[PDB]
Structures are given as C-alpha cells and as structure tokens.
Amino acid sequence: SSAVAILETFQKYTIDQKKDTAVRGLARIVQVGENKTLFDITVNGVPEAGNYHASIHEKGDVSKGVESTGKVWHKFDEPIECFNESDLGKNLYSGKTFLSAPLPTWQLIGRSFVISKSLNHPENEPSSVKDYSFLGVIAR
Ligand SMILES: [Ca+2]
C-alpha cells in the first residue's frame, strides 16, 4: 500500500520569491509492516536553512494553509535537516530523511502532511504567521 503528499506553500511569504511552482517537497509513503508506514521525505527550494519538523494534521482542508487543517494528529520527533544549498542565486536549501510511524496507510489518507520551521524574521511577514510551512493532502 502506498500514498503520496505533494507539499506546497499556501501562504505568501516575503522570503519566498520562487514563482515557477509552489512545490517545496514530497512525501512518498509506503506501508512496510502490518501497522507501520515509511515516509520518504525530500525538501527543495526553501529560503531558510535549518531544522524543519513534520506532523500530520487532522483535516485535509488546506484552503487556508496550515490554519485550516485543525490540530496536530501525529507528530514526528526526528527533525528534517535542510542545510544543503541547492539554489545559489536565490540561496535556497534542500534536505531529506526517512521517517516512520506505527500507522497503516489507510488511516493516513485524506489528512494533511505538514512541514514547518519558525521564521528567522517574523516581523517582516507579521504577526500571526510565525512559521514557514508547506503542506499537502495525503492521497492514495
Ligand atoms: Ca535564503
């Protein structure tokens, strides 16, 4: 059993001026046990280097980005380190990791996969937006 989440920004951020696509990462999801899923995560094109954090939120509603997705339903403890500079002109970064969760794929479908990091300079994209986030509905 497999699934995928295409991760896009929904918010507009001053620091993110890459306009050919809003896609900033991919989660490829494969069940690897009766009740265990593997998450193959890659990130690309994010403006700030740092440790990013993944969660799965309760709702598949991304109309308002993270703010419409409800609460955190599953949290991953392991960070995603994004320190590889992949765009020199724009100074954008990439990263990758494998994560796992003790959940079958069927319980994941239709929820939102979210990766986020606190903004280095929130005063310049204020004031209710604290985090840079990119997210996508999980689909079979
Ligand atoms: Ca940058």
Does residue 132 contact residue 66 with C-beta atoms inside 8 Å? no
Q: Which residues pair with 76 in a beta bridge?
A: none
Resolution in units of Å: 1.5
d(CA 104, CA 81): 26
Distance CA 93, CA 24 (A): 10
Distance 133 CA to ligand 1 centre (A): 15
**81 Cα to the center of ligand 1, angstroms:** 15
Say how far apart CA 86 and CA 91 lie, in whole Å: 7
Question: Residue 31 C-alpha to ligand 1 middle, in angstroms?
Answer: 35
Distance from the CA of 54 to the center of ligand 1, in angstroms? 20
Phi, psi of 106, deg, nearest 5? -60, -20
How much distance in Å is there from the Cα of 110 to the middle of ligand 1? 32
- What's the sign of the alpha-carbon dihedral 11, 40, 71, 68? positive
Residue type for position 71:
K
CA of 88 to the centre of ligand 1 (A): 9
Count of Cβ atoms closer than 10 Å to residue 64 Cβ: 10
Q: How far is the CA of 15 from the centre of ligand 1 (A)?
A: 7
- Domains for the chain: give ranges and CATH numbers: 1-140 (2.60.40.200)
Q: What are phi and psi of 5, to 5 degrees?
A: -135, 120
Question: How many angstroms does the Cα of residue 91 sit away from the middle of ligand 1?
Answer: 4
Contacts (Cβ under 8 Å, ≥6 apart) of 137? 5, 60, 62, 110, 111, 112, 113
Q: What is the distance in A from the centroid of ligand 1 to the CA of 89?
A: 9
d(CA 18, CA 126): 20
Tokens matching residue 37: 């899923």
